[PDB]
Amino acid sequence: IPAWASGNLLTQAIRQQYYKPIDVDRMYGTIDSPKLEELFNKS
Amino acid sequence: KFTIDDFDIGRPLGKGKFGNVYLAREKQNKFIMALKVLFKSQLEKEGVEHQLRREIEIQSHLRHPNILRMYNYFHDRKRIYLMLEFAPRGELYKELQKHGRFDEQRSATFMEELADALHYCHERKVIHRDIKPENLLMGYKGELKIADFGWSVHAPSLRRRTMCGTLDYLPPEMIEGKTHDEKVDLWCAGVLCYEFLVGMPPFDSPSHTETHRRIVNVDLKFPPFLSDGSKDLISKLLRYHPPQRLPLKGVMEHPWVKANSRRVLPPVY
Numbered sequence: 555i556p557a558w559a560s561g562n563l564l565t566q567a568i569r570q571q572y573y574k575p576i577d578v579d580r581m582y583g584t585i586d587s588p589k590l591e592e593l594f595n596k597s
Numbered sequence: 598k599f600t601i602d603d604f605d606i607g608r609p610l611g612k613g614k615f616g617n618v619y620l621a622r623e624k625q626n627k628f629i630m631a632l633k634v635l636f637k638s639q640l641e642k643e644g645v646e647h648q649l650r651r652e653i654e655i656q657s658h659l660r661h662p663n664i665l666r667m668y669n670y671f672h673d674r675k676r677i678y679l680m681l682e683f684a685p686r687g688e689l690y691k692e693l694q695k696h697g698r699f700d701e702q703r704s705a706t707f708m709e710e711l712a713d714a715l716h717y718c719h720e721r722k723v724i725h726r727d728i729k730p731e732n733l734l735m736g737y738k739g740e741l742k743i744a745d746f747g748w749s750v751h752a753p754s755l756r757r758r759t760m761c762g763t764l765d766y767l768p769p770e771m772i773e774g775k776t777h778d779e780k781v782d783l784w785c786a787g788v789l790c791y792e793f794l795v796g797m798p799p800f801d802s803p804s805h806t807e808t809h810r811r812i813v814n815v816d817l818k819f820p821p822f823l824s825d826g827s828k829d830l831i832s833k834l835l836r837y838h839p840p841q842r843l844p845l846k847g848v849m850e851h852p853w854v855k856a857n858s859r860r861v862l863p864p865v866y
């Protein structure tokens with residue numbers, strides 16, 4: 555378990571993320587998705 | 598597009614049927630999320646491919662503070678990965694089990710958050726059909742997050758016929774083989790409120806047939822410690838006739854919810 559993923563390091567990060575939300579709609583929501591029909595196909 | 602290498606894997610959060618869920622960090626943004634991994638071969642073998650793509654279609658198009666967000670998804674040779682909102686406080690059912698029952702403040706807050714999320718779904722003709730503690734997670738400040746859409750359906754026109762959900766949560770119309778609509782979720786909200794406050798669902802019985810019987814008779818027996826307000830809300834949701842059930846807006850506006858909810862909306866970008 556890497557340091558960031560436990561104890562005070564995780565808690566700190568989680569709190570920062572709650573109070574400083576990023577634009578997930580642009581950061582991830584705008585990024586291309588594999589078409590649902592191609593999910594069980596080649597990658 | 599994303600790949601697994603784009604994430605620091607922290608640790609497993611839970612096991613599932615088709616893969617595990619992991620605490621993960623997206624590297625570029627140092628942004629903490631959950632990564633659900635599903636194995637393509639096991640999904641195909643079990644014959645649940647179209648089930649999964651339905652769940653993904655529904656959840657990936659919902660944006661609400663009380664619905665667990667699916668940011669995106671990707672796949673590689675062997676795996677399908679779902680990038681999900683991390684819910685720091687974990688499983689609501691574990692918290693309920695830990696405490697036995699929730700106090701009125703906790704229960705009322707949850708009910709407001711639930712009614713708001715369900716209203717959002719119904720506005721889009723999505724019926725959930727399996728509201729119960731095990732399908733809810735909790736955010737940083739304990740905010741309810743509808744986490745699982747396993748029985749959910751987009752139902753624009755036709756009323757539905759599938760008996761689904763969980764025994765203790767089934768509405769009379771499902772048990773009786775009638776068609777159902779979005780008002781099934783009103784019933785399940787009433788069952789949920791009762792379970793929040795009592796720690797057991799209202800129609801608890803050792804047999805399927807006795808449970809069925811209590812449901813269709815609405816054999817509701819309120820424990821003495823319940824407030825008049827909580828009983829009022831539950832009674833207004835657990836109506837035999839779907840059209841008589843308190844609407845979701847009605848739950849949000851109910852005086853007991855107003856008086857006891859300490860609901861906080863998460864900061865938005």
Ligand SMILES: COc1cc2c(Nc3ccc(NC(=O)c4ccccc4)cc3)ncnc2cc1OCCCN1CCOCC1
Nearest residue numbers: 610611618631633652653681682683684685686687688744
């Ligand atoms: C260990 O349970 C967790 C599960 C989580 C979790 N689990 C999910 C797994 C899968 C999932 N979606 C699907 O499986 C799925 C399947 C088909 C289509 C769409 C979604 C949603 C949520 N997501 C986000 N955050 C979570 C956070 C979780 O726990 C955080 C730890 C909380 N806490 C820490 C100390 O006190 C006790 C526990």
